Amino acid sequence: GRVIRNQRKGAGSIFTSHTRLRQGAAKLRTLDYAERHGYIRGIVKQIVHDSGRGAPLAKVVFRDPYKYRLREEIFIANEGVHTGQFIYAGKKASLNVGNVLPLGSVPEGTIVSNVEEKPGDRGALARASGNYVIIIGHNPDENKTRVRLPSGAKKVISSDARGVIGVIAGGGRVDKPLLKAGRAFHKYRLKRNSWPKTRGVAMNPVDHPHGGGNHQHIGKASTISRGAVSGQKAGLIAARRTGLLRGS
Amino acid sequence: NPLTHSTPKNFGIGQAVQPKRNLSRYVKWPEYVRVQRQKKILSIRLKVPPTIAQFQYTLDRNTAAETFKLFNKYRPETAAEKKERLTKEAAAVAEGKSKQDASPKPYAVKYGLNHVVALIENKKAKLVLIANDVDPIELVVFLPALCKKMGVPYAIVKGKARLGTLVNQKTSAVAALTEVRAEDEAALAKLVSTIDANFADKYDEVKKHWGGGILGNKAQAKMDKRAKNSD
Amino acid sequence: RPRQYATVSKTHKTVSRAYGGSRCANCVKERIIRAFLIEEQKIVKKVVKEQTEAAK
Amino acid sequence: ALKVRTSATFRLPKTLKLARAPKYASKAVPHYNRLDSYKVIEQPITSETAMKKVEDGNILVFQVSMKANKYQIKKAVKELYEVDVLKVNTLVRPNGTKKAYVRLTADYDALDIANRIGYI
RNA sequence: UUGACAUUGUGAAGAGAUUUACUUAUUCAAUGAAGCGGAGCUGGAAUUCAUUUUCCACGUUCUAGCAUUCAAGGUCCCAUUCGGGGCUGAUCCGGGUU
RNA sequence: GCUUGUGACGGCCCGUGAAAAUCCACAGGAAGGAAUAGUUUUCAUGCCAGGUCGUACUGAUAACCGCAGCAGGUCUCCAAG
RNA sequence: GAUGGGGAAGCUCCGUUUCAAAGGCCUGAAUGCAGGCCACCAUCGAAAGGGAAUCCGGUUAAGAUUCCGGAACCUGG
Ligand SMILES: NC[C@@H]1O[C@H](O[C@H]2[C@@H](O)[C@H](O[C@@H]3[C@@H](O)[C@H](N)C[C@H](N)[C@H]3O[C@H]3O[C@H](CO)[C@@H](O)[C@H](O)[C@H]3N)O[C@@H]2CO)[C@H](N)[C@@H](O)[C@@H]1O
Ligand SMILES: NC[C@@H]1O[C@H](O[C@H]2[C@@H](O)[C@H](O[C@@H]3[C@@H](O)[C@H](N)C[C@H](N)[C@H]3O[C@H]3O[C@H](CO)[C@@H](O)[C@H](O)[C@H]3N)O[C@@H]2CO)[C@H](N)[C@@H](O)[C@@H]1O
Ligand SMILES: NC[C@@H]1O[C@H](O[C@H]2[C@@H](O)[C@H](O[C@@H]3[C@@H](O)[C@H](N)C[C@H](N)[C@H]3O[C@H]3O[C@H](CO)[C@@H](O)[C@H](O)[C@H]3N)O[C@@H]2CO)[C@H](N)[C@@H](O)[C@@H]1O
Ligand SMILES: [Mg+2]
Ligand SMILES: [Mg+2]
Ligand SMILES: [Mg+2]
Ligand SMILES: [Mg+2]
Ligand SMILES: [Mg+2]
Ligand SMILES: [Mg+2]
Ligand SMILES: [Mg+2]
Ligand SMILES: [Mg+2]
Ligand SMILES: [Mg+2]
Ligand SMILES: [Mg+2]
Ligand SMILES: [Mg+2]
Ligand SMILES: [Mg+2]
Ligand SMILES: [Mg+2]
Ligand SMILES: [Mg+2]
Ligand SMILES: [Mg+2]
Ligand SMILES: [Mg+2]
Ligand SMILES: [Mg+2]
Ligand SMILES: [Mg+2]
Ligand SMILES: [Mg+2]
Ligand SMILES: [Mg+2]
Ligand SMILES: [Mg+2]
Ligand SMILES: [Mg+2]
Ligand SMILES: [Mg+2]
Ligand SMILES: [Mg+2]
Ligand SMILES: [Mg+2]
Ligand SMILES: [Mg+2]
Ligand SMILES: [Mg+2]
Ligand SMILES: [Mg+2]
Ligand SMILES: [Mg+2]
Ligand SMILES: [Mg+2]
Ligand SMILES: [Mg+2]
Ligand SMILES: [Mg+2]
Ligand SMILES: [Mg+2]
Ligand SMILES: [Mg+2]
Ligand SMILES: [Mg+2]
Ligand SMILES: [Mg+2]
Numbered sequence: 001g002r003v004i005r006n007q008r009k010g011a012g013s014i015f016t017s018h019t020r021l022r023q024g025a026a027k028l029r030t031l032d033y034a035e036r037h038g039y040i041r042g043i044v045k046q047i048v049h050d051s052g053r054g055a056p057l058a059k060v061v062f063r064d065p066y067k068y069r070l071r072e073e074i075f076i077a078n079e080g081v082h083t084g085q086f087i088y089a090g091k092k093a094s095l096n097v098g099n100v101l102p103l104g105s106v107p108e109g110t111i112v113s114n115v116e117e118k119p120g121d122r123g124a125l126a127r128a129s130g131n132y133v134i135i136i137g138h139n140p141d142e143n144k145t146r147v148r149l150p151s152g153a154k155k156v157i158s159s160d161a162r163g164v165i166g167v168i169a170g171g172g173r174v175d176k177p178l179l180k181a182g183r184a185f186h187k188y189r190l191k192r193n194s195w196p197k198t199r200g201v202a203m204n205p206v207d208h209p210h211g212g213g214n215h216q217h218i219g220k221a222s223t224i225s226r227g228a229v230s231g232q233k234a235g236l237i238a239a240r241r242t243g244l245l246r247g248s
Numbered sequence: 249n250p251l252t253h254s255t256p257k258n259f260g261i262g263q264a265v266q267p268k269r270n271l272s273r274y275v276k277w278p279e280y281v282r283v284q285r286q287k288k289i290l291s292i293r294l295k296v297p298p299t300i301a302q303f304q305y306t307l308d309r310n311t312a313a314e315t316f317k318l319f320n321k322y323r324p325e326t327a328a329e330k331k332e333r334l335t336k337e338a339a340a341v342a343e344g345k346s347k348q349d350a351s352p353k354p355y356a357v358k359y360g361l362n363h364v365v366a367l368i369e370n371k372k373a374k375l376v377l378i379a380n381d382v383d384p385i386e387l388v389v390f391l392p393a394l395c396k397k398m399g400v401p402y403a404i405v406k407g408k409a410r411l412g413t414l415v416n417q418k419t420s421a422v423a424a425l426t427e428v429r430a431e432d433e434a435a436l437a438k439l440v441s442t443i444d445a446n447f448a449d450k451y452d453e454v455k456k457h458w459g460g461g462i463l464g465n466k467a468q469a470k471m472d473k474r475a476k477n478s479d
Numbered sequence: 480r481p482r483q484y485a486t487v488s489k490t491h492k493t494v495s496r497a498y499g500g501s502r503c504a505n506c507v508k509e510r511i512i513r514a515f516l517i518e519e520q521k522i523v524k525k526v527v528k529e530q531t532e533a534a535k
Numbered sequence: 536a537l538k539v540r541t542s543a544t545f546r547l548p549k550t551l552k553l554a555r556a557p558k559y560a561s562k563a564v565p566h567y568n569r570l571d572s573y574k575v576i577e578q579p580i581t582s583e584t585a586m587k588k589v590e591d592g593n594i595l596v597f598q599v600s601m602k603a604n605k606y607q608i609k610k611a612v613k614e615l616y617e618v619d620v621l622k623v624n625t626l627v628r629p630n631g632t633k634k635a636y637v638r639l640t641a642d643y644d645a646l647d648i649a650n651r652i653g654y655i
Numbered sequence: 656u657u658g659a660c661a662u663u664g665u666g667a668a669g670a671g672a673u674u675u676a677c678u679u680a681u682u683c684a685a686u687g688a689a690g691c692g693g694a695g696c697u698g699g700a701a702u703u704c705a706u707u708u709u710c711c712a713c714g715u716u717c718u719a720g721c722a723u724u725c726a727a728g729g730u731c732c733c734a735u736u737c738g739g740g741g742c743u744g745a746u747c748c749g750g751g752u753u
Numbered sequence: 754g755c756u757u758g759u760g761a762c763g764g765c766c767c768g769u770g771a772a773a774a775u776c777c778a779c780a781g782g783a784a785g786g787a788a789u790a791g792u793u794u795u796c797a798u799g800c801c802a803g804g805u806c807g808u809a810c811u812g813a814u815a816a817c818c819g820c821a822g823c824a825g826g827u828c829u830c831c832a833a834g
Numbered sequence: 835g836a837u838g839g840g841g842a843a844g845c846u847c848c849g850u851u852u853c854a855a856a857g858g859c860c861u862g863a864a865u866g867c868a869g870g871c872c873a874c875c876a877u878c879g880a881a882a883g884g885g886a887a888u889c890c891g892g893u894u895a896a897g898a899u900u901c902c903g904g905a906a907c908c909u910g911g
């Protein structure tokens with residue numbers, strides 16, 4: 001046989017991300033004396049669009065605590081954050097949209113974005129346009145909150161971990177139908193080259209396990225094991241069950 | 249005075265860029281610096297076996313500097329000191345004076361390892377000085393168990409390099425004398441009996457007990473304030 | 480063009496005011512004012528919160 | 536005791552960096568001056584065209600060391616033929632030899648000095 | 656992928672004819688390795704074996720300013736024509752960067 | 754009217770449309786600073802110098818590729834009635 | 835794509851600010867000590883990208899925004 005398409009992607013080459021026109025990385029401010037004890041103030045200087053990301057970025061200046069200089073940060077704008085507003089950052093900071101706080105420092109029910117999985121990693125969960133995570137409870141022991149992630153699975157993280165108050169801008173972006181091949185073409189021109197996608201059942205047997213011909217059919221179960229080997233994994237991979245669900 | 253004003257800076261979160269402070273604890277140190285500090289701590293933690301931990305019992309500078317002062321009048325023959333005794337006595341005795349009798353019998357501090365051990369094996373020395381800092385530590389540790397069984401009184405001392413300046417060199421490890429001066433018989437057996445106190449006879453107690461432990465600062469105040477306060 | 484500015488007299492590269500180049504006019508005007516209003520209200524906030532410090 | 540570390544960023548201390556005391560030279564004798572003035576200007580270019588430039592343009596056309604820049608040329612042109620050199624334009628002929636167009640100032644006649652070198 | 660053996664140290668219970676101590680190996684994360692760990696200053700109630708008696712606070716939030724010169728002030732030395740040094744300003748103690 | 758540049762604008766995106774060298778400017782106040790004088794070289798004028806390699810010509814039904822002076826292939830500027 | 839480095843029997847592989855003690859400016863006292871700031875970072879990579887600055891007229895068998903005549907400009911002293 002050949003090396004199927006989904007193997008060739010881990011070598012980089014063609015399949016690397018298209019990064020040129022991006023803003024910087026979107027990261028919180030470093031977790032320091034400022035945010036850990038008091039709070040800090042900075043102006044969101046502009047929000048702005050980041051290529052291949054559908055979730056506008058907010059550029060927040062801060063004043064360097066330990067030297068006289070300005071320090072710019074790249075935050076993911078939270079829907080209602082606005083140019084000129086004052087962002088407050090720390091455990092003593094208030095509860096308001098745009099502010100970044102420790103998680104134990106909010107009451108349960110609070111909704112938050114860009115939330116760190118462990119303290120000071122400068123944010124992971126709910127970065128995408130229109131995402132949020134709700135704090136479902138706290139702990140006396142071991143600085144633990146517990147939160148429900150956008151996937152719906154609840155995960156228990158450190159009450160010292162941060163997150164910014166709100167839910168990311170960029171709204172209902174996926175409601176609008178792509179409507180055209182070209183609209184999906186430019187979608188991925190600025191992201192990575194996964195598009196368009198040729199169907200494995202349409203290839204020859206050399207190119208894909210599906211590629212058996214003479215009719216177009218997969219010919220053996222489309223559900224592959226987890227212990228399967230690189231080059232056999234195509235189709236429904238760990239699939240627990242299959243078919244149309246209708247599960248609300 | 250009142251052409252001026254008193255304008256205190258707020259030096260607190262949100263204002264007034266912090267003043268220079270002593271970061272000497274926070275400094276990111278060169279790698280070699282890190283290890284030598286961290287090699288200590290590693291040896292400070294864990295559990296030291298008895299025969300290794302039998303050191304760190306050292307001689308207080310009181311007994312030390314006085315012991316050293318005894319040894320310090322016994323310095324072995326030096327560079328120019330060997331020019332005199334040789335080119336004179338090897339001349340004056342050449343065809344003339346008596347063989348080996350033309351120069352006086354010496355008294356010195358008798359240095360080197362296989363030197364010192366062979367003595368202690370043959371019971372020809374009285375006071376031994378074994379320095380605490382020797383890498384490898386195996387070059388020594390057998391002696392305190394050997395010096396007891398051979399009945400030679402010994403002293404674990406500071407200054408592997410301190411014992412060296414006594415002997416003219418940079419470093420020493422073992423330094424032990426043998427004969428001494430007929431007058432100094434007092435101090436030696438005064439040293440022997442007060443040095444037999446800490447490490448000679450008390451040594452068999454040092455063995456039974458091990459060493460190690462030392463949770464260190466942040467872990468100490470954690471266990472104290474846990475069990476010993478409230479928990 | 481950028482390097483031509485090292486060939487030109489300084490009475491081009493600026494005008495006469497605080498922030499002669501850089502920020503313009505109404506923005507330097509708004510600069511002054513907004514400073515003064517917060518500096519005042521600072522004093523006001525120190526004292527009104529130093530009086531509820533005192534008599535209680 | 537202690538010391539005040541004002542910064543937590545460590546840096547390599549400065550150190551004397553002694554000068555060099557060789558003890559045996561390198562070379563036996565320094566190289567004599569390669570590319571001297573009798574090298575630089577190599578030979579005249581006497582072609583009928585360059586010739587017409589002598590009796591009109593007040594320019595002396597010379598083959599030159601490929602290694603000789605416009606300074607070396609002008610210095611060695613002055614030194615050898617004892618004249619003031621206005622300007623110097625050098626190309627490299629197709630054959631891989633440099634041709635220099637050396638203009639003499641108003642104070643001199645290029646045709647005179649030409650057949651003072653004995654070509655005319 | 657699963658088991659074993661070795662990297663592999665220190666502890667405690669409670670079970671058969673397995674749950675969880677500790678940090679120094681090793682593993683991850685952050686930093687231009689700044690503010691950790693313990694104790695103390697001052698302010699309020701704890702309150703009456705009128706104290707050792709614990710808890711609490713202990714610099715920034717109407718504003719699209721400003722924030723840098725080992726710090727002004729205060730308090731000591733020097734002969735100080737002019738600048739010059741110590742400590743305070745900014746508690747202490749450990750050097751375990753978090 | 755043609756080509757073309759510029760001024761003011763309108764629309765398009767789940768596409769919002771390089772980087773660095775370089776140059777000027779501001780805030781700041783370290784500093785030097787005059788009277789029988791000391792100040793400024795971002796105002797005018799005046800002095801000297803600027804190396805090295807390339808530079809021809811074809812660029813195509815003959816100068817490149819395609820065994821060739823091959824009906825093929827090979828990026829671009831100017832454009833009259 | 836070197837460098838502390840970490841792989842690989844090795845030819846070599848990874849890495850480009852990383853688990854590194856990674857410096858080079860301006861001033862005074864003809865040159866060292868005393869000042870002092872500042873310090874994440876070799877280099878290669880565009881004859882269509884960025885970019886200091888020239889024009890006209892004349893001239894050859896064959897070169898010219900290059901030569902000549904005239905008029906300029908830019909960088910560096
Ligand atoms: N991925 C590119 C990013 O560019 C960013 O830089 C942003 C700005 O600093 C930069 O702005 C440039 C400016 O540098 C340059 N000196 C002048 C230029 N007109 C500006 O351009 C920008 O602003 C103008 C006016 O609003 C717009 O017309 C233009 O479309 C826009 N790109 O353009 C970016 C915004 O478009 C950051 N350097 C960084 O996040 C990253 O490198
Ligand atoms: N159009 C906006 C919304 O899009 C979603 O609908 C889409 C998805 O729900 C559904 O699944 C798509 C999947 O087909 C497509 N190949 C990839 C996409 N990520 C999937 O979406 C799915 O996974 C994402 C996470 O990846 C989950 O957050 C989401 O709940 C889930 N439905 O495919 C639908 C389109 O074919 C909403 N479920 C739907 O109610 C609504 O139309
Ligand atoms: N932008 C201000 C106006 O620009 C006008 O001229 C502008 C327009 O002709 C043209 O601007 C177009 C605009 O027409 C059109 N409707 C929107 C488009 N984005 C603009 O383009 C401009 O901005 C984009 C960034 O979005 C830049 O990447 C691009 O280089 C820039 N020309 O480019 C010019 C420079 O921006 C006039 N000068 C005047 O009316 C006024 O100054
Ligand atoms: Mg194959
Ligand atoms: Mg990439
Ligand atoms: Mg494609
Ligand atoms: Mg599809
Ligand atoms: Mg398809
Ligand atoms: Mg087929
Ligand atoms: Mg197959
Ligand atoms: Mg098939
Ligand atoms: Mg078929
Ligand atoms: Mg068929
Ligand atoms: Mg079909
Ligand atoms: Mg089918
Ligand atoms: Mg199969
Ligand atoms: Mg014991
Ligand atoms: Mg002006
Ligand atoms: Mg040339
Ligand atoms: Mg020729
Ligand atoms: Mg295994
Ligand atoms: Mg097991
Ligand atoms: Mg085990
Ligand atoms: Mg017409
Ligand atoms: Mg684009
Ligand atoms: Mg300017
Ligand atoms: Mg100014
Ligand atoms: Mg030409
Ligand atoms: Mg030509
Ligand atoms: Mg043509
Ligand atoms: Mg042809
Ligand atoms: Mg051909
Ligand atoms: Mg044709
Ligand atoms: Mg053709
Ligand atoms: Mg074509
Ligand atoms: Mg490489
Ligand atoms: Mg590294
Ligand atoms: Mg020097
Ligand atoms: Mg170019």
Ligand SMILES: [Mg+2]
Nearest residue numbers: 809810897898
């Ligand atoms: Mg021509």
Ligand SMILES: [Mg+2]
Nearest residue numbers: 901902903904
């Ligand atoms: Mg001319």
